Amino acid sequence: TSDLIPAPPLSKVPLQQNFQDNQFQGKWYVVGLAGNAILREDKPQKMYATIYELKEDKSYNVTSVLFRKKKCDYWIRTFVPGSQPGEFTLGNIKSYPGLTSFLVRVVSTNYNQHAMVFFKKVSQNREYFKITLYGRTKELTSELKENFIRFSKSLGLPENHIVFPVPIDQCID
């Protein structure tokens, strides 16, 4: 009825040392996507952007913008700070039907170029996980993308569960 690559132990997912929320705020482009529910379809995903607004209460108003059939779809959610800096939970998690658990963890970032962020959730009793490769520009180096693929494979994800959204100019600018 369902077959999912197991979610990795959170020991296999690093946390960015001394996470600086003021440095991380702003728009990132989703340069890479990987996870147990992600599948690479050659018949290819369009690039979408995500803007992290560091609010005065130190929460993030996360607004994602994607181009879809054929309009600018905006989806806005709230990430509230977790136990330690660099970790977040979903604001108003109870309002999402089926969603019982949700965690965000910033794996690594230099704030001005690249970032890797780990997502894990329990939806309908099924544990899903995802790693997103963020980029300040709509393109990154092969060094950056190769490290993302390497990190994805270390969490048990094969190549067809690792995708690189095609750059576009609509909505995300």
| Residues in Cβ contact with 130 at an 8 Å cutoff, skipping those fewer than 6 apart | 33, 34, 35, 36, 37, 38, 118, 119, 120
AA identity, residue 112: N
Detail the DSSP E strand segments found in 12-169: 26-35, 49-54, 60-68, 71-81, 87-90, 99-109, 114-123, 126-135, 162-163
Nearer to ligand DBS, 79 or 111 (CB): 79
Pick one of 47, 48, 109, 121: the residue that binds ligand DBS (CB under 6 A). Answer: 121
Q: Are the C-beta atoms of 7 and 129 separated by less than 8 Å?
A: yes
Q: Which stretch binds ligand DBS (CB under 6 A): 13-21, 57-65, 80-88, 123-131?
A: 123-131
Binds ligand DBS by CB under 6 A, chosen from 4, 10, 37, 166: 37
Is residue 109 near Na ion by the rule CB under 5 A? no
Of these partners, Na ion, ligand DBS, none, which one is at the site of residue 152 (CB under 5 to 8 Å by kind)?
Answer: none
Q: Is 50 in the site for Na ion (CB under 5 A)?
A: yes
Of residues 12 through 31, those in contact with ligand DBS by CB under 6 A are none
> Judged by CB under 6 A, does residue 130 bind ligand DBS?
yes
- Find the angle CA(105)-CA(106)-CA(108) to the nearest 5 degrees: 145
The nearer residue to ligand DBS, 38 or 144, going by C-beta atoms, is 38
Whether residue 70 has a cis bond before it, omega within 30° of 0: yes
CB-nearer residue toward ligand DBS: 114 or 121: 121
